[PDB]
Structure 1
Amino acid sequence: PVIPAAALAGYTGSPPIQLWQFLLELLTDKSCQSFISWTGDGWEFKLSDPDEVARRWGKRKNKPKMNYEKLSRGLRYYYDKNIIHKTAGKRYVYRFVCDLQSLLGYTPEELHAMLDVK
């Protein structure tokens, strides 16, 4: 993990980790780029293998029956709260719309390079 995205997002062990914070944590872990990754455009990402992301989310939240169908519902709840938005027309592509730069302390360009995103 290049940086402590989880902690920089607000996660401190106290209230259980939130779905957006968890995704952030996968986006900053080189070993997960195989199923989830930044698209290279700002804070936009694409879940290349939703079922996998779902399983992890499930295991991490101790909810064995968790599936993408249910997780995507979680994501849609962020639309109004302006944490994450959907990239219209692009399958499984979403985008953080909050101020990750202030939180993480890095600009997208910087983080992408740090993670050797291509």
Structure 2
Amino acid sequence: VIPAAALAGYTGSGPIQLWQFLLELLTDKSCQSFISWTGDGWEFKLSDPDEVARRWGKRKNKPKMNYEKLSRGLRYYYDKNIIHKTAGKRYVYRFV
């Protein structure tokens, strides 16, 4: 249930691109047991990023990273038109 490293298998061919990784993990395995992926147009909410949130901080050899970070670094990520957060709730994320 972690086909990320198996799907990616994308080697140390340079650090991955932030959103490309997140976007690759998005349209990936089930995502029903650890998060919520609607089966309609393109809506993505983070229900329980327990494995995602700790993988995010693990890549940096950092043991634990709360989710506030993503609301932090992901927010400042409005540099390119790639992932915009939804003004609906707070754990609702979206991509263009």
TM-score, normalised to structure 2's length?
A: 0.66
Specify whether residues 55 and 25 from structure 1 end up closer, same or farther in structure 2 by C-alpha distance, changes over 3 A only: same
Identity %: 99
Deviations 1:18-63 (A, max 9, x none): 3322322322332543223433453331111134321121223422
Inter-partner Cα distance in structure 2 for 1:7 and 1:87: 30
Unmatched 5+ residue regions in structure 2? Answer: none
Inter-partner Cα distance in structure 2 for 1:3 and 1:70: 22
Q: CA deviation at 1:13?
A: 3.2
Unmatched 5+ residue regions in structure 1? Answer: 97-118
Specify whether residues 78 and 72 from structure 1 end up closer, same or farther in structure 2 by C-alpha distance, changes over 3 A only: same
68-77 vs 26-35, which moves further: 26-35
Q: CA RMSD in A?
A: 3.8
Inter-partner Cα distance in structure 1 for 2:78 and 2:9: 19
Q: CA deviation at 1:86?
A: 1.0
Specify whether residues 45 and 21 from structure 1 end up closer, same or farther in structure 2 by C-alpha distance, changes over 3 A only: same
Specify whether residues 31 and 10 from structure 1 end up closer, same or farther in structure 2 by C-alpha distance, changes over 3 A only: closer
**Structure number with higher helix proportion:** 1
Inter-partner Cα distance in structure 2 for 1:17 and 1:62: 16
Specify whether residues 58 and 3 from structure 1 end up closer, same or farther in structure 2 by C-alpha distance, changes over 3 A only: closer
TM-score, normalised to structure 1's length?
A: 0.57
- Asked if structure 1 preserves the Cα contact closer than 8 Å seen for 2:34 and 2:47, the reply is yes
What are the equivalent positions in structure 2 for 1:94-113 lying under 5 Å apart? 94-96=93-95
What residue is the counterpart of 1:43 in the other structure? 42
Aligned residues: 95
- Asked if structure 2 preserves the Cα contact closer than 8 Å seen for 1:86 and 1:94, the reply is yes
- Asked if structure 2 preserves the Cα contact closer than 8 Å seen for 1:35 and 1:52, the reply is yes
Q: Report SS of the residue matched to 2:44.
A: strand
Specify whether residues 84 and 10 from structure 1 end up closer, same or farther in structure 2 by C-alpha distance, changes over 3 A only: farther
